[PDB]
Amino acid sequence: NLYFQSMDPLLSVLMWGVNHSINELSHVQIPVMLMPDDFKAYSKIKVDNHLFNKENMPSHFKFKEYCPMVFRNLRERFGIDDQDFQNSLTRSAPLPNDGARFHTSYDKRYIIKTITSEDVAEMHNILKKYHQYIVECHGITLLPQFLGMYRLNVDGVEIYVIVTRNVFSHRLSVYRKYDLKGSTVAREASDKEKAKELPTLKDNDFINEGQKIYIDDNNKKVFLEKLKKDVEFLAQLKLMDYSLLVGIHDVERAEQEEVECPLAPGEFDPNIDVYGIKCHENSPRKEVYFMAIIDILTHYDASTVNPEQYSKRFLDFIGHIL
Amino acid sequence: LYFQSMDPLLSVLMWGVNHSINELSHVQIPVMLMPDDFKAYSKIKVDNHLFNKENMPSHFKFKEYCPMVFRNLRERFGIDDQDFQNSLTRSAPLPNDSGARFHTSYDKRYIIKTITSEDVAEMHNILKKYHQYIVECHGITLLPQFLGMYRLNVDGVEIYVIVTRNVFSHRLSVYRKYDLKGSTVAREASDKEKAKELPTLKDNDFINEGQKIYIDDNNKKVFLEKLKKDVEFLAQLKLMDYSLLVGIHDVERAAPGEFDPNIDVYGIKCHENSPRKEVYFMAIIDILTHYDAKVNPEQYSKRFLDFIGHIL
Numbered sequence: 124n125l126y127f128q129s130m131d132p133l134l135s136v137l138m139w140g141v142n143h144s145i146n147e148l149s150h151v152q153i154p155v156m157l158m159p160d161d162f163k164a165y166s167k168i169k170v171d172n173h174l175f176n177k178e179n180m181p182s183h184f185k186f187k188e189y190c191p192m193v194f195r196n197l198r199e200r201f202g203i204d205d206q207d208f209q210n211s212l213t214r215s216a217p218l219p220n221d222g223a224r225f226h227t228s229y230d231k232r233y234i235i236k237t238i239t240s241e242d243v244a245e246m247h248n249i250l251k252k253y254h255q256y257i258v259e260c261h262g263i264t265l266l267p268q269f270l271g272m273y274r275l276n277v278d279g280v281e282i283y284v285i286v287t288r289n290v291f292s293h294r295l296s297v298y299r300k301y302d303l304k305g306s307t308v309a310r311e312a313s314d315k316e317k318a319k320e321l322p323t324l325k326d327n328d329f330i331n332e333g334q335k336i337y338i339d340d341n342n343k344k345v346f347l348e349k350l351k352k353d354v355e356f357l358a359q360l361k362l363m364d365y366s367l368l369v370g371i372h373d374v375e376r377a378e379q380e381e382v383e384c385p386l387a388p389g390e391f392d393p394n395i396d397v398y399g400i401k402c403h404e405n406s407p408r409k410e411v412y413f414m415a416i417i418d419i420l421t422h423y424d425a426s427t428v429n430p431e432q433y434s435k436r437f438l439d440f441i442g443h444i445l
Numbered sequence: 446l447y448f449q450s451m452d453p454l455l456s457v458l459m460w461g462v463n464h465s466i467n468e469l470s471h472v473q474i475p476v477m478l479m480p481d482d483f484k485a486y487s488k489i490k491v492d493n494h495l496f497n498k499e500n501m502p503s504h505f506k507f508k509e510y511c512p513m514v515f516r517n518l519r520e521r522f523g524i525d526d527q528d529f530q531n532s533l534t535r536s537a538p539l540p541n542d543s544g545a546r547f548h549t550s551y552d553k554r555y556i557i558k559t560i561t562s563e564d565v566a567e568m569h570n571i572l573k574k575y576h577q578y579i580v581e582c583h584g585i586t587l588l589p590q591f592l593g594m595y596r597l598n599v600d601g602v603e604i605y606v607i608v609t610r611n612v613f614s615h616r617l618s619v620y621r622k623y624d625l626k627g628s629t630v631a632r633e634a635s636d637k638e639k640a641k642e643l644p645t646l647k648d649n650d651f652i653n654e655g656q657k658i659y660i661d662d663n664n665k666k667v668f669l670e671k672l673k674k675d676v677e678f679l680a681q682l683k684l685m686d687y688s689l690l691v692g693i694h695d696v697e698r699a700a701p702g703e704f705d706p707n708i709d710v711y712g713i714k715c716h717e718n719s720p721r722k723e724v725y726f727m728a729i730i731d732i733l734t735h736y737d738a739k740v741n742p743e744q745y746s747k748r749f750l751d752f753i754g755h756i757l
C-alpha cells in the first residue's frame with residue numbers, strides 16, 4: 124500500500140499533501156459556482172510526529188494549498204477526476220527530468236515544477252481571469268492547465284510547487300522535442316544539451332535540422348485558431364516569454380525499440396493525451412505531434428519587447444513553421 | 446460526510462479520527478510494538494483561510510497519543526479500523542444528558558469521555574502493562590477497552606478525550622443500570638438522578654430493590670474468574686475506585702433476547718429458570734485512580750470482588 128517514501132523529503136511531503144488535499148475536498152461540497160473569496164483562500168497543515176512513522180516520512184513538515192476550490196474546479200473543467208489525480212501524484216514518487224529541473228508523475232500524466240513566491244503572487248494576480256477564460260473556451264485551450272499549487276516546508280527548506288498537465292503522451296514516447304519562441308538571436312541548444320538522450324532543442328535547431336510538421340490543412344487551421352485566442356489572452360494579461368513546446372513521436376522508431384525488448388501503433392486516447400495531432404496521410408514518416416503553450420508567467424512590469432509585439436512575433440513564427 | 450456539528454469540538458474529534466485512521470492506513474502493521482510506540486504521538490495543526498468555513502472551524506489542532514498502541518488494542522479487541530472510523534465519523538456522537546457527561550457513537554458501539562491531563566499522564570504510566578495484560582488474556586477481559594486517546598484544541602479551548610467500548614448493547618435497550626463498587630460506605634442515587642428515564646443506581650439501590658442477576662453456574666464461574674484476574678491486575682497497578690457497570694435488558698417488553706457476542710461482547714443471557722427473561726451487560730469502568738492520590742488497592746479489590754460474588 125501507499126507509504127509516500129522517497130530519498131527526497133520534499134517529494135514525500137508533496138505526495139502526503141496531495142493525498143491529504145484531495146481527501147479533505149472529498150469532505151467539502153462542490154459549490155454551484157466559485158466566489159471571489161475562493162481566489163484568496165488557502166489550507167495550511169503543520170504535522171509534528173514524535174516516534175511515529177519515523178521511517179517512511181519526515182517527522183516535522185508543513186504543507187499549504189492555494190485556492191483549493193479553484194484548482195478543484197479547474198481539474199474538473201479539464202476532464203480530470205480528483206481520485207485519478209490523487210493516484211497519479213501519490214501511488215509512486217514523481218520522477219526527476221534528470222532551475223531547468225522538473226518532475227513527471229510516475230504515470231507521465233502530470234508535470235511538477237518548483238516556482239518562486241513571485242510566481243505564486245502572479246498566479247493569484249491572473250487566477251480569476253484564467254478561470255473565466257477556461258469557462259468560456261469549455262476547457263479547450265493550448266494554455267498550461269494549472270491543476271494544483273502548493274507550498275512545502277521540511278528540514279528548513281521552503282519551496283512553492285505547480286502541477287500542470289503533460290503536453291506529451293502518457294504512453295507514446297517523444298524522440299524529439301522543441302521549445303519554440305521566435306525572434307531570439309542564438310536561441311538554440313548548447314553542446315551539453317545536444318549530447319543528452321532527449322535534448323530540449325530550440326528555434327535555430329528547428330530551422331537548421333529541416334524540421335517539418337505534417338498535419339492536414341484542417342488540423343493546422345483549428346490549431347493556429349486556438350493559438351491566436353490563447354496568445355491574445357496572454358497579451359491582454361501583459362504576459363510574455365512563453366514557448367510552444369513541440370514533442371514528436373516516431374511510430375517506426377518506437378516500434379524498433381519494442382522489438383529489442385488495444386491502441387494500434389500511432390493511436391492515442393485524445394481524452395488523456397489532449398494535445399496530440401496525427402500526421403497527414405502523406406507524411407514521409409508516421410508521426411504524432413504533441414504541441415501546447417508552456418511557461419506563461421512573466422509579467423511585462425517584471426531590447427524590452429512588449430506583450431503585444433511578443434504575441435505577434437510568436438504567432439508569426441509558429442505560422443511560418445506550422 | 447462534512448463532520449458538521451453545533452459543537453466545534455465534536456467536528457474536530459470526527460475530523461481527527463477520520464485523519465488518524467486514514468494516516469494509519471499509510472503506516473506498516475509492525476511484527477510487534479516497541480517501547481518508543483508507548484511514548485509516541487501525532488500532532489496536526491490546521492489553519493484554513495476562506496476555505497470550508499461552513500462545516501468546520503478554520504483553526505484547530507488534533508493530537509493522537511500512541512497511535513500504534515491503540516491501533517493494536519483495537520485489533521486485539523476484534524475492532525476493524527474502517528468500522529471504528531465509520532462509527533466515530535459517519536454521524537456526530539450523541540451527548541448522554543445535560544463531569545458526569547459522556548457521548549455515545551451514533552451507532553452506540555463506543556463511549557467518548559473528556560479526561561484531564563492527569564488522566565493522560567496516568568494512561569501513559571499504565572499503558573505498557575495494560576497492553577501486555579491484553580496480550581496475555583487474548584483480549585478476553587472485563588477491563589475497559591481503551592481504543593483511542595486524543596487532545597483537541599479549537600477556539601482557545603483544549604480537551605483530552607478517551608474512547609472506550611460501550612458495556613451496553615448497540616441494539617437492546619437497558620431498562621435498569623447500576624454502578625457497583627462494594628463500598629460498605631453510603632452509595633445511593635440522588636432524588637434528581639432517580640427522576641430520570643434511566644437513572645445510574647448504586648450499591649444500596651441494588652440491595653434495597655432486591656435486584657437479582659440470574660446467570661447459570663458456567664457463565665458465573667467464567668465471569669467471576671475473569672473479574673478476579675482483572676481486579677488483581679488493577680490492585681497490582683495500585684488503581685482503585687472502579688465500578689462494575691450492570692445494565693439489564695428486559696426481553697418480555699418486546700429475535701427477542703438475542704445479540705451478537707462479537708459486537709455486544711459483555712452480554713450474558715439469564716438462567717433458563719429465571720423468573721424474568723433478561724440479558725445482563727456487565728463490565729468494569731472508570732479505573733484510572735492511583736492510590737498515590739493521598740482503604741488501599743488490595744482492600745478495594747477484595748471488598749469489590751466479595752460484593753460482586755455476593756450478588757452473582
Ligand SMILES: CC[C@@H](Nc1c(C#N)c(-c2ccc(-c3cccc(Cl)c3F)cc2)nc2cnccc12)C(N)=O
Binds near residue numbers: 242289
Ligand atoms: C522545456 C520544458 C521542460 N519540460 C516541461 C516544463 C518545464 N520545465 C513545463 C513547465 C514549465 C514551466 C512551468 C512554470 C514555471 C514557473 C511558473 C509557473 Cl506557474 C509554471 F507553471 C511549469 C511547467 N511544462 C511541461 C509540460 N509538458 C511537458 C514538458 C514540460 C523540458 N526541458 O522539457
Ligand SMILES: CC[C@@H](Nc1c(C#N)c(-c2ccc(-c3cccc(Cl)c3F)cc2)nc2cnccc12)C(N)=O
Binds near residue numbers: 558564589624
Ligand atoms: C456510569 C457512567 C456513564 N456511562 C459510561 C461511562 C461513563 N462516564 C464510561 C466511562 C467512564 C469513565 C471513563 C474515564 C474517565 C477518566 C479517564 C479515563 Cl481513561 C476514562 F476511561 C471513560 C468511560 N463507560 C461506559 C461504558 N459503557 C456504558 C456506559 C459507560 C453513565 N452514566 O451511564
